[PDB]
Design an enzyme around this catalytic site. Structure first.
Site, PDB file in Angstrom:
ATOM      1  N   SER A 179       0.762  -1.234   0.000  1.00  0.00           N
ATOM      2  CA  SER A 179       0.000   0.000   0.000  1.00  0.00           C
ATOM      3  C   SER A 179       0.795   1.287   0.000  1.00  0.00           C
ATOM      4  CB  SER A 179      -0.981   0.024   1.162  1.00  0.00           C
ATOM      5  OG  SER A 179      -2.065  -0.851   0.896  1.00  0.00           O
TER       6      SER A 179
ATOM      7  N   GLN B  70     -11.372  -4.552  -0.037  1.00  0.00           N
ATOM      8  CA  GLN B  70     -10.981  -5.384  -1.163  1.00  0.00           C
ATOM      9  C   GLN B  70     -12.032  -5.521  -2.258  1.00  0.00           C
ATOM     10  OE1 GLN B  70      -8.897  -8.566   1.312  1.00  0.00           O
ATOM     11  NE2 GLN B  70      -9.210  -9.650  -0.646  1.00  0.00           N
TER      12      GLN B  70
ATOM     13  N   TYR C 229     -10.620   2.840   5.205  1.00  0.00           N
ATOM     14  CA  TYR C 229      -9.476   2.490   4.377  1.00  0.00           C
ATOM     15  C   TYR C 229      -9.834   1.440   3.321  1.00  0.00           C
ATOM     16  CZ  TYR C 229      -4.631   1.213   3.327  1.00  0.00           C
ATOM     17  OH  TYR C 229      -3.428   0.926   2.758  1.00  0.00           O
TER      18      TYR C 229
ATOM     19  N   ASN D 217      -8.951  -0.338  -0.845  1.00  0.00           N
ATOM     20  CA  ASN D 217      -8.312  -0.434  -2.151  1.00  0.00           C
ATOM     21  C   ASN D 217      -9.322  -0.078  -3.216  1.00  0.00           C
ATOM     22  OD1 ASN D 217      -5.908  -1.454  -1.040  1.00  0.00           O
ATOM     23  ND2 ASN D 217      -6.559  -3.577  -1.323  1.00  0.00           N
TER      24      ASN D 217
ATOM     25  N   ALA E  50       1.905  -3.421   2.791  1.00  0.00           N
ATOM     26  CA  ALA E  50       2.123  -4.830   2.999  1.00  0.00           C
ATOM     27  C   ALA E  50       1.467  -5.629   1.903  1.00  0.00           C
ATOM     28  CB  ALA E  50       1.571  -5.247   4.344  1.00  0.00           C
TER      29      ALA E  50
ATOM     30  N   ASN F 165       6.083  -9.956   5.988  1.00  0.00           N
ATOM     31  CA  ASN F 165       5.039  -9.113   6.527  1.00  0.00           C
ATOM     32  C   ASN F 165       5.031  -9.244   8.062  1.00  0.00           C
ATOM     33  OD1 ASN F 165       2.796  -7.610   6.985  1.00  0.00           O
ATOM     34  ND2 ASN F 165       1.485  -8.679   5.513  1.00  0.00           N
TER      35      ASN F 165
HETATM   36  B1  LIG Z   1      -1.969  -2.061   2.027  1.00  0.00           B
HETATM   37  O1  LIG Z   1      -0.766  -2.778   2.078  1.00  0.00           O
HETATM   38  O2  LIG Z   1      -2.566  -1.621   3.300  1.00  0.00           O
HETATM   39  C1  LIG Z   1      -2.969  -3.141   1.475  1.00  0.00           C
HETATM   40  C2  LIG Z   1      -3.989  -3.699   2.171  1.00  0.00           C
HETATM   41  C3  LIG Z   1      -4.626  -4.713   1.359  1.00  0.00           C
HETATM   42  C4  LIG Z   1      -4.067  -4.840   0.128  1.00  0.00           C
HETATM   43  C5  LIG Z   1      -4.557  -5.807  -0.854  1.00  0.00           C
HETATM   44  C6  LIG Z   1      -5.644  -6.617  -0.517  1.00  0.00           C
HETATM   45  C7  LIG Z   1      -6.235  -6.490   0.758  1.00  0.00           C
HETATM   46  C8  LIG Z   1      -5.743  -5.548   1.702  1.00  0.00           C
HETATM   47  S1  LIG Z   1      -2.765  -3.786  -0.124  1.00  0.00           S
END
Ligand SMILES: *[B]([O])([O])C1=[C]C2=C([C]=[C][C]=[C]2)S1
Ligand SMILES: *[B]([O])([O])C1=[C]C2=C([C]=[C][C]=[C]2)S1
EC number: 3.5.2.6
Lengths: 358, 358
Positions: free
Chosen positions: A61, A117, A147, A149, A315, A340
């Site tokens: 992210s 997601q 939060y 995506n 992550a 991670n």
């Molecule tokens: B970021 O690293 O906070 C992310 C959180 C998610 C991602 C992909 C799928 C689900 C949660 S990237």
């Protein structure tokens, strides 16, 4: 590097790599505008290949920060407005619930509960439209931050619409190249495959999986050298030649919403400095970081504040990354690992280091 | 200057001066960044002093643009936020109606009906507090626009508070000096009096009278050369060395509200380019320019749009000024006269001239 920097880093990161059992790690500390690199373990345990300045890491992210700045650039180019309705860039998104949802809501996760997601089943462009067309909001737009995506990812995809370029090509030409990020990719090419580290989850080696809006929300891979440049550019945007990018980086760090002691920018999240360590450390735990939170609109947005702790955690299945910086102190840090591990562990380590250096 | 520029200018301005009986006038056209000067008539009809590039003219409300940029530099400095409530800077402002009235409302005339002029009877600092304490809003803040000196003026007075500097000092120190506006004043010094032109109201020579918040709302006097420098600075702000001033200029040209096809910035007013001449010419008439009009908030504010017609009219008892520029084309004009004549006449002339140069 100065004994000082060497000292805290070794005392802080080395033990952390041990406790978390992190296979490989690259750390860059930006001190007084200058970067210093640290390296540990392997990028590939099997081939005992080590972590170098050229090892590629999945940012997860932290990609969102690139997406936010690409967005900011498009606004300075006059191609998009954050006040513009979503349907203006996707005429087929006709369902009535999309009526008052603007690009700003999409960019800051305040559209009313779009999911973290995009379901794995959504693949075709058709699948995507149907998914968004059927979405029922949990809250009125602009009231809660959740939060996701599926929110910022859609922002990325529509933001590059007027330019006529694909997301990847707009990103390479408008952001990567001008900043000379010669080793940052959404799709790593053949030539770079050998420097591309393996992520490790449950002893097994993994790489992020394809998915809808993956590129827009979490698909960038990079090296600590490029990332260090990324932090230097964000620390001092006036030093940037390209006019729209300089303004884009600034728009990306403006404060649009407030929730608790955090402020939401485009991709970037900010906190007034000095910061309360418990706050950023604990707040980064996913129980909190992933929960819905009421937001207060900042009317009008506050322009990029120099005295801020600016950061973002990232992550993927087998990678853990983190970036933080304080413009006012020309201080910043980048942490890339092919494992991670707990967000609170990264933020704490970063706070120990940076607090030590000013 | 190129015969092209020289021809258009004389063809347009000559009959205007004749028609309006303007005693003296100074004009500057900024073409491809370079300024070109033109002057006619008398600064002082009695002593037959000619208008020159050193003659001082009262800017009238064109001063609000300086005030808007001074405010923006203060935001860029982190000393004030447009989102803050007026009472955060004037605690003594206890009246309840002041509750949700922000610096933004004050800077843009959307506080809820604040009057055009501060009563002549208001002289003391206490007199000002009383006036504001007893004022009763006509509308909710952020709903209607009513052009007012009592509104933008109060904004300028509060914006310099944190700085600890008086308004005139903050202006000289933070705006005039950096831009090298060495012949621009709020109070013209004895050394410069000889260049101070007389205004002419129905045959009588007059200078602007003192009044509450005059400095902040209509107090600047300048020359055609400094105004040209003012225009160039606003056309290309990214060429300004001072970080916060360059940001302040951009903040003053951002779009906070829309009314009709006009957008309101801090001091500056904008329209999309190309623009309908009648859209401006007509909207300028003091009847149409100071009336109550409902506004639409632009959420979030659009950053300075390069493709706009940016302008401001100004008038005092004996002076009439106008400034207009199109960033996208690096084209602008300034017209200063020691006679207050019809706004549509100014806009018509400015348009003829700039339209003819692309
Ligand atoms: B970021 O690293 O906070 C992310 C959180 C998610 C991602 C992909 C799928 C689900 C949660 S990237
Ligand atoms: B500006 O030139 O529009 C001005 C309007 C007024 C001024 C002073 C007093 C009343 C109105 S300056």
């Amino acid at each position: 590097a100065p004994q000082q920097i060497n000292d805290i880093v070794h005392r802080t990161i080395t033990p952390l790599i041990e406790q978390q059992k992190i296979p490989g790690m690259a750390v860059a500390v930006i001190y007084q505008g200058k970067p210093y690199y640290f390296t540990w373990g392997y990028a590939d345990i099997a081939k005992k290949q080590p972590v170098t300045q050229q090892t590629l890491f999945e940012l997860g992210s932290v990609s969102k920060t690139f997406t936010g700045v690409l967005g900011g650039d498009a606004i300075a180019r006059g191609e998009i407005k954050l006040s513009d309705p979503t349907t203006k860039y996707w005429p087929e998104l006709t369902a009535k619930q999309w009526n008052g949802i603007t690009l700003l809501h999409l960019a800051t996760y305040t559209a009313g509960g779009l999911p973290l997601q995009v379901p794995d089943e959504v693949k075709s462009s058709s699948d995507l439209l149907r998914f968004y067309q059927n979405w029922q909001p949990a809250w009125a737009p602009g009231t809660q931050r959740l939060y996701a995506n599926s929110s910022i990812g859609l922002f990325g995809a529509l933001a590059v619409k007027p330019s006529g370029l694909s997301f990847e090509q707009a990103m390479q030409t408008r952001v990567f190249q001008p900043l000379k990020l010669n080793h940052t990719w959404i799709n790593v090419p053949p030539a770079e495959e050998k420097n591309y580290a393996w992520g490790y989850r449950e002893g097994k080696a993994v790489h992020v999986s394809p998915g809808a809006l993956d590129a827009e929300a979490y698909g960038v891979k990079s090296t600590i050298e490029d990332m260090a440049r990324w932090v230097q550019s964000n620390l001092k945007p006036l030093d940037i030649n390209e006019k729209t990018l300089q303004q884009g980086i600034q728009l990306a760090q403006s404060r649009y919403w407030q929730t608790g002691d955090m402020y939401q920018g485009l991709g970037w999240e900010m906190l007034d400095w000095p910061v309360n360590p418990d706050s950023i450390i604990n707040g980064s735990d996913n129980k909190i970081a992933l929960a819905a939170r009421p937001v207060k609109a900042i009317t009008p947005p506050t322009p990029a504040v120099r005295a801020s702790w600016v950061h973002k955690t990232g992550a993927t299945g087998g990678f853990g990354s983190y970036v933080a910086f304080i413009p006012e102190k020309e201080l910043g840090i980048v942490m890339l690992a092919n494992k991670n591990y707990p967000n609170p562990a990264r933020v704490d380590a970063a706070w120990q280091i940076l607090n030590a250096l000013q």
